[PDB]
């Protein structure tokens, strides 16, 4: 389906594999990718690269839950009718995330 | 940085992960201890006839001078040396640390 081919969706890659792709030093902070959650059925995960001078480059993982209406959310502040709309939103506003989403993981 | 370090995932999460594949015995990861500050926890899959596949958890204590241990037999000056040692020598663990959790 459409989601399978989104440039930012990485399907069933593991959290460890997403950190392997995201921790690459070429990536600016806020490089991200969406994937299925490995440990929660039916949820997704937004993994975001970030940096601090103590953990080094690191990745933060945010569960994305799906509501019975069909929407999605990470926080109580905002919900979205699609992952596409969630990504578009957090590309414009961190709003609790470690960083605004900037580069789509290559 | 290490591919086997899974950071703050939980005990339950590690068990979901370590058991969630066609993962052999001896698949493992290291994570921050939930129960004890400063320590880590080594989680390793195992198989036995009564339990079937199951996960064992081993505290990794941190010494004041900097090193780490799980038993009195050997201690390590870093956490990576611990992992490297137990990949070659089970020494009391259920199995050697052979496959990093995918």
From Swiss-Prot, chain B:
Signal peptide: none annotated. It is found in: Cell membrane; Mitochondrion inner membrane; Nucleus; Cytoplasm, Cytoskeleton. Residues 4-101 form the SH2 domain. It comes from the Eukaryota. Expressed ubiquitously. Expressed in the skin (at protein level). Platelets, neurons and osteoclasts express 5-fold to 200-fold higher levels than most other tissues. The modification Phosphotyrosine is found at residue 40. Transmembrane segments: none annotated. The phosphorylated form is termed pp60c-src. It is linked to SRC kinase activity has been shown to be increased in several tumor tissues and tumor cell lines such as colon carcinoma cells. Thrombocytopenia 6: A form of thrombocytopenia, a hematologic disorder defined by a decrease in the number of platelets in circulating blood, resulting in the potential for increased bleeding and decreased ability for clotting. THC6 is an autosomal dominant form. Affected individuals may also have bone abnormalities and an increased risk for myelofibrosis. The SH2 and SH3 domains are important for the intramolecular and intermolecular interactions that regulate catalytic activity, localization, and substrate recruitment. Non-receptor protein tyrosine kinase which is activated following engagement of many different classes of cellular receptors including immune response receptors, integrins and other adhesion receptors, receptor protein tyrosine kinases, G protein-coupled receptors as well as cytokine receptors. Participates in signaling pathways that control a diverse spectrum of biological activities including gene transcription, immune response, cell adhesion, cell cycle progression, apoptosis, migration, and transformation. Belongs to the protein kinase superfamily. Tyr protein kinase family. SRC subfamily. May be involved in blister formation in Pemphigus vulgaris, phosphorylated-SRC is abundant at blister sites but not in normally adherent tissue, which corresponds with loss and disruption of CDH1 in cells adjacent to blisters. Phosphorylated SRC is increasingly abundant at pre-lesional sites of blister formation and occurs prior to changes in abundance of CDH1 and DSG3. Part of a complex comprised of PTPRA, BCAR1, BCAR3 (via SH2 domain) and SRC; the formation of the complex is dependent on integrin mediated-tyrosine phosphorylation of PTPRA. Interacts with DDEF1/ASAP1; via the SH3 domain. Interacts with CCPG1. Identified in a complex containing FGFR4, NCAM1, CDH2, PLCG1, FRS2, SRC, SHC1, GAP43 and CTTN. Interacts with ERBB2, STAT1 and PNN. Interacts with DDR1, DDR2 and DAB2. Interacts with CDCP1, TGFB1I1 and TOM1L2. Interacts with the cytoplasmic domain of MUC1, phosphorylates it and increases binding of MUC1 with beta-catenin. This is Proto-oncogene tyrosine-protein kinase Src. The chain holds residues 148 to 249 of 536 of the full protein.
């Amino acid at each position: 389906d459409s989601i399978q081919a989104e440039e930012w969706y990485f399907g069933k890659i593991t959290r460890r594999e997403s950190e392997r792709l995201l921790l690459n030093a070429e990536n600016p902070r806020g490089t991200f990718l969406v994937r299925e959650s490995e440990t929660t059925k039916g949820a997704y995960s937004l993994s975001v690269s970030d940096f601090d001078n103590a953990k080094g480059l690191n990745v933060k993982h945010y569960k994305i839950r799906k509501l019975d209406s069909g929407g999605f959310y990470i926080t109580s502040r905002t919900q979205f009718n699609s992952l596409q709309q969630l990504v578009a939103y957090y590309s414009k506003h961190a709003d609790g995330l470690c960083h605004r989403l900037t580069t789509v993981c290559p």
